[PDB]
Amino acid sequence: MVLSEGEWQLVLHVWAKVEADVAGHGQDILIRLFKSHPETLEKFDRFKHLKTEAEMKASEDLKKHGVTVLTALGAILKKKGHHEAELKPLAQSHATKHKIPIKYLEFISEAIIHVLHSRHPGDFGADAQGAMNKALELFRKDIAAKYKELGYQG
Ligand code: HEM
């Protein structure tokens, strides 16, 4: 919501580890999101037709879209909260086109945290998790504000 410089540094230190295998992370993140919250899968006309985890893992379009997620998220995180300009095209498309409730951003946030733990068991401790949770919460809160700015949501 306002992160210390130390929390931002933790977030960016973890993000460098995402950026080492963006495709792997983005794929895992989307797969965890879809398994943990199947209702979010129905939002994706391109993916609605993927059922087992093994099918999702073989979908190169799913992998590609994971990259799209994480590169966009990464650009935002690197702004360390000064992300107003980067949020609006995202808020605009997710509020008005894809028509995504903020609650779904909470689900993918949990999916990010979970995947970071499974891919970096030793690098992603309690500190880094707190910082990343805070950064993603700030992201969600700011996206929520941008929804309301566009006249949408709760
Ligand atoms: C960290 C959170 C997220 C980020 C950074 C993100 C980013 C993006 C980006 C960059 C695109 C492509 C351009 C666009 O349509 O805006 C996209 C498309 C899309 N997003 Fe997200 N997204 C996030 C969370 C979610 C969630 C949780 C859902 C649904 C449960 C969702 C649903 C969609 C859909 C349906 C599309 C269109 C994809 C397609 O064309 O097949 N997004 N997202």
Numbering used by the authors: 0 to 153
Per the authors:
Here, we describe a high-throughput approach to serial oscillation crystallography. Using the silicon microchip technology with fast translation that has proven to be useful for serial collection of still data from crystals at XFELs and synchrotrons, we have found that adding oscillation to crystal data collection dramatically decreases the number of crystals needed to generate a complete dataset, compared with still data collection. We tested three different protein crystals for this study: FAcD, lysozyme and CO-SWMb. The high-throughput, fixed-target serial oscillation crystallography method described here is a practical, fast and economical means to collect high-quality room-temperature diffraction data with minimized background scattering.
For example, in a previous work using the chip setup with CO-SWMb crystals, still data from 1776 crystals were required in order to generate a complete dataset; in our work, with 5° oscillations per crystal, only 138 crystals were needed. In the case of lysozyme and CO-SWMb, which have smaller unit cells, 1° oscillation gave an insufficient number of reflections (<200) per dataset to calculate accurate scaling factors; many datasets did not have reflections in common with the others and XSCALE failed. On average, 1° of exposure at 10° s−1 led to ∼70 kGy of dose per crystal. This is tolerable for room temperature, but longer exposures, particularly on crystals with radiation-sensitive metals like the iron-containing CO-SWMb, may lead to significant radiation damage. Crystals of CO-SWMb, on the other hand, are more prone to radiation damage because of the iron in the heme moiety, but our method did not lead to appreciable changes in structure after dose. To study this, we collected crystals of CO-SWMb at 5° oscillation – far more than needed per crystal – to effectively ‘burn’ each crystal with a dose of 197 kGy.
